[PDB]
Amino acid sequence: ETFKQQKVEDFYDIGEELGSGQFAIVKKCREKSTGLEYAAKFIKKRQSRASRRGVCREEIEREVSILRQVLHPNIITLHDVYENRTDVVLILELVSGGELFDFLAQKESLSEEEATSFIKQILDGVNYLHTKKIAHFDLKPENIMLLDKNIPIPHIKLIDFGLAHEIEDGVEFKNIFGTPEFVAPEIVNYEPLGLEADMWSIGVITYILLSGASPFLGDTKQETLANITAVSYDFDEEFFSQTSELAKDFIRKLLVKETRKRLTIQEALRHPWITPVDTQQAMVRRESVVNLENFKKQYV
Amino acid sequence: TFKQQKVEDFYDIGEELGSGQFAIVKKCREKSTGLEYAAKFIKKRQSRASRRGVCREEIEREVSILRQVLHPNIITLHDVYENRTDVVLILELVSGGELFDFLAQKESLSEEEATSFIKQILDGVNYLHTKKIAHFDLKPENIMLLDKNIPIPHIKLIDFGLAHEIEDGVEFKNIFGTPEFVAPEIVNYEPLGLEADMWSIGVITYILLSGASPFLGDTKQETLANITAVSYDFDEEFFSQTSELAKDFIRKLLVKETRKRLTIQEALRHPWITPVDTQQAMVRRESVVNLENFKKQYV
Ligand SMILES: Nc1ncnc2c1ncn2[C@@H]1O[C@H](COP(=O)(O)OP(=O)(O)OP(=O)(O)O)[C@@H](O)[C@H]1O
Ligand SMILES: Nc1ncnc2c1ncn2[C@@H]1O[C@H](COP(=O)(O)OP(=O)(O)OP(=O)(O)O)[C@@H](O)[C@H]1O
Numbered sequence: 001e002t003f004k005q006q007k008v009e010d011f012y013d014i015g016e017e018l019g020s021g022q023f024a025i026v027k028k029c030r031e032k033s034t035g036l037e038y039a040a041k042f043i044k045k046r047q048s049r050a051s052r053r054g055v056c057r058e059e060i061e062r063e064v065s066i067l068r069q070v071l072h073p074n075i076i077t078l079h080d081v082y083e084n085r086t087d088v089v090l091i092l093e094l095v096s097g098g099e100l101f102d103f104l105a106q107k108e109s110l111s112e113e114e115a116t117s118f119i120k121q122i123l124d125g126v127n128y129l130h131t132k133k134i135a136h137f138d139l140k141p142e143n144i145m146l147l148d149k150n151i152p153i154p155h156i157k158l159i160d161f162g163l164a165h166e167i168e169d170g171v172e173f174k175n176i177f178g179t180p181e182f183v184a185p186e187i188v189n190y191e192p193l194g195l196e197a198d199m200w201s202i203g204v205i206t207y208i209l210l211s212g213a214s215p216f217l218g219d220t221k222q223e224t225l226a227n228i229t230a231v232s233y234d235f236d237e238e239f240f241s242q243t244s245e246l247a248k249d250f251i252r253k254l255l256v257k258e259t260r261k262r263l264t265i266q267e268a269l270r271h272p273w274i275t276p277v278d279t280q281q282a283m284v285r286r287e288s289v290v291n292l293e294n295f296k297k298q299y300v
Numbered sequence: 301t302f303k304q305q306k307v308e309d310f311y312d313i314g315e316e317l318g319s320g321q322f323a324i325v326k327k328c329r330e331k332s333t334g335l336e337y338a339a340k341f342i343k344k345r346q347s348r349a350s351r352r353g354v355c356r357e358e359i360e361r362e363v364s365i366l367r368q369v370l371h372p373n374i375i376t377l378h379d380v381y382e383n384r385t386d387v388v389l390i391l392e393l394v395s396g397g398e399l400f401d402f403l404a405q406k407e408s409l410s411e412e413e414a415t416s417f418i419k420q421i422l423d424g425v426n427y428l429h430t431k432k433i434a435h436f437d438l439k440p441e442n443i444m445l446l447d448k449n450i451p452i453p454h455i456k457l458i459d460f461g462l463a464h465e466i467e468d469g470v471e472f473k474n475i476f477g478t479p480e481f482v483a484p485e486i487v488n489y490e491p492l493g494l495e496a497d498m499w500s501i502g503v504i505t506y507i508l509l510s511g512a513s514p515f516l517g518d519t520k521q522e523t524l525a526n527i528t529a530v531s532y533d534f535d536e537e538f539f540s541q542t543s544e545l546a547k548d549f550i551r552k553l554l555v556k557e558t559r560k561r562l563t564i565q566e567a568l569r570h571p572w573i574t575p576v577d578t579q580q581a582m583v584r585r586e587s588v589v590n591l592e593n594f595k596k597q598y599v
């Protein structure tokens with residue numbers, strides 16, 4: 001294999017907890033031999049086939065195999081991998097700027113021009129993944145972090161490749177996962193999956209970024225899932241009164257059930273709201289404001 | 301109808317009995333009577349987008365269901381308290397632990413004794429289905445024993461968080477439950493009804509007799525694929541001693557089409573559960589279930 005069969009603490013000073021998940025716990029760490037800081041993701045290994053605790057080795061191996069391929073300014077980087085009896089430790093690029101949303105919710109003002117630039121960083125990272133036929137499958141606010149939040153315009157880093165999967169043509173992939181608020185119809189309906197699900201998720205994230213409201217979120221999970229499969233949502237003037245038709249058009253073409261009619265990552269990159277084809281479109285975007293009030297309300 | 305009062309004014313809260321993603325169960329004793337119960341604290345969800353706690357409407361719905369059910373094989377609701385953060389379900393105390401843990405330490409086990417426990421489960425499910433209540437979370441860890449310390453333990457079905465009342469002509473669809481035990485209609489996101497409970501019964505029986513699991517793959521993805529394809533077998537390695545009637549019982553439960561699947565009444569009427577003659581009963585009496593594989597899987 002490739003996993004270092006050594007004590008990670010022999011080589012890293014283990015620091016304070018960054019965050020935790022279902023089967024992983026992530027901590028700051030410093031490599032003794034270089035003094036360089038990283039994030040150590042301790043993934044609990046699954047002990048038996050019929051256990052809901054931890055992660056089976058093959059899937060961990062899958063996450064690593066994917067991480068080793070990815071080198072891009074908007075994606076986290078893999079440094080090394082260790083393993084003992086209980087855990088597999090992913091040594092990852094440390095992202096210290098927290099989440100993007102928490103940063104935006106901190107903001108005094110924010111135009112669509114500023115918004116689309118953050119969104120383009122995300123598109124840039126997703127474009128690179130899709131090029132290598134990699135589906136993230138876990139695109140959601142908390143997996144969108146910032147390297148350094150103490151600069152005027154922070155850099156985005158996509159994390160958490162636990163659900164990432166390489167798409168092979170002819171090889172049907174179906175599975176049930178992800179947070180209901182952000183999953184595409186083909187996930188809910190347990191239908192063939194591909195690169196398009198990422199694009200739907202981008203639509204949802206954009207909807208929220210601009211309005212503070214969530215397109216399909218119901219009072220209960222049953223409703224959310226029903227909303228998703230009916231593609232039932234609206235641009236409530238209460239929240240969208242200042243949002244530009246271009247933004248709405250961008251969102252509309254993402255939140256589409258038929259996977260084939262949904263915008264690709266390249267088409268998203270080339271959408272006028274992201275890449276204006278003239279002066280006029282640029283000014284409009286520059287004149288549209290994000291609903292920071294409602295956004296703060298929902299994410300506070 | 302939730303008492304807006306401190307549970308602790310009316311109960312002595314004892315040791316923690318168990319815990320899940322949303323609740324923590326503790327032993328308790330009512331002061332006025334000195335009777336013991338299990339106090340299940342459910343954290344109320346605070347925001348629609350939050351993944352923590354449970355929506356209050358859903359908790360209200362579970363209680364609405366619990367209040368209706370009185371049956372020896374179903375847990376009994378005693379009372380409901382509520383404070384800032386938690387809804388506290390005061391439930392019948394069950395002290396015998398989980399059925400499987402008890403089987404896993406049993407010396408010997410025949411099919412007769414197995415159908416005895418399965419019968420109790422069917423009785424409890426039948427009562428529910430008569431009132432149109434689908435459990436939707438039938439799995440080993442929700443099959444508890446009242447006593448543990450007797451020749452034949454009494455089964456109590458617990459955990460009604462996913463329970464739902466099936467309304468005629470009102471489609472119900474949702475994603476939930478443990479993959480190993482969910483029906484194809486759940487995986488496929490299709491109309492849900494009383495049939496899902498029956499599929500789960502089949503899986504539980506399959507495990508009980510062989511120690512093996514019918515659709516369990518190396519990953520959740522495979523398990524789901526196995527379920528929707530209804531791809532399983534009776535591996536001789538594990539089913540060598542299993543009676544034909546037993547396999548027929550399971551075979552009629554693990555069926556994709558919800559209209560073909562055995563109903564609870566048909567399950568109670570199956571010859572493996574309710575033999576039609578002396579001959580059938582003997583075959584079940586001499587049918588020994590090897591506990592070896594079961595213990596390997598559940599110790
Ligand atoms: N490189 C990193 N730097 C700082 N914090 C991180 C880093 N990677 C992950 N985290 C923390 O862990 C979370 C990311 O999820 P993680 O990669 O732990 O997935 P997981 O726990 O294996 O599965 P899931 O979290 O999806 O249930 C983030 O919320 C973040 O707070
Ligand atoms: N009535 C009871 N009497 C004694 N112990 C109980 C009782 N109910 C639950 N417990 C203990 O708590 C554990 C979990 O109970 P239960 O399965 O109802 O909740 P959960 O599965 O943790 O949460 P969820 O409702 O989200 O599934 C059980 O395994 C059991 O050990």
Ligand SMILES: [Ca+2]
Binds near residue numbers: 189190191489490
């Ligand atoms: Ca379907």
